[PDB]
Amino acid sequence: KDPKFEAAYDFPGSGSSSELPLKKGDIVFISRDEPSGWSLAKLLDGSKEGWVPTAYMTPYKDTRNTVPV
């Protein structure tokens, strides 16, 4: 169970292969992130790891449905 994140910005495969093509509202695992601005995103099936811009991946609400009042 890696920390799940959610692509707040669509990520069209520009180079891909080393990248992790995502879309606004796609959810993957972040395995690590580099201060170059890229988080190593791994598909939520654990299929393929790739790089995706850090600012795109927002902490996905899994196991958390905190209802306020």
UniProtKB/Swiss-Prot annotation:
It comes from the Eukaryota. Phosphorylation probably activates the myosin-I ATPase. Residues 1-62 form the SH3 domain. It is found in: Cytoplasm, Cytoskeleton, Actin patch. Changing W38S: Abolishes interaction with LAS17 and causes severe mislocalization of the protein. One of two redundant type-I myosins implicated in the organization of the actin cytoskeleton. Required for proper actin cytoskeleton polarization and for the internalization step in endocytosis. At the cell cortex, assembles in patch-like structures together with proteins from the actin-polymerizing machinery and promotes actin assembly. Functions redundantly with LAS17 as actin nucleation-promoting factor (NPF) for the Arp2/3 complex. Motor domain phosphorylation by PAK kinases CLA4 and STE20 promotes CDC42-regulated actin assembly. Present with 155 molecules/cell in log phase SD medium. Interacts (via myosin motor domain) with SHE4; this interaction is important for proper localization and may regulate the interaction of the motor domain with actin. Interacts (via SH3 domain) with VRP1; this interaction is required for localization to sites of polarized growth and may regulate the interaction of the tail domain with actin. Interacts (via SH3 domain) with PAN1; this interaction is important for late stages of endocytopsis. Interacts (via SH3 domain) with BBC1 and LAS17. Interacts (via C-terminal acidic tail) with ARC19 and ARC40; ARC19 and ARC40 are Arp2/3 complex subunits. Belongs to the TRAFAC class myosin-kinesin ATPase superfamily. Myosin family. The myosin motor domain displays actin-stimulated ATPase activity and generates a mechanochemical force. The tail domain participates in molecular interactions that specify the role of the motor domain. It is composed of several tail homology (TH) domains, namely a putative phospholipid-binding myosin tail domain (also named TH1), an Ala- and Pro-rich domain (TH2), followed by an SH3 domain and a C-terminal acidic domain (TH3). This is Myosin-3. It comes from Saccharomyces cerevisiae (strain ATCC 204508 / S288c) (Baker's yeast). The chain holds residues 1121 to 1189 of 1272 of the full protein.
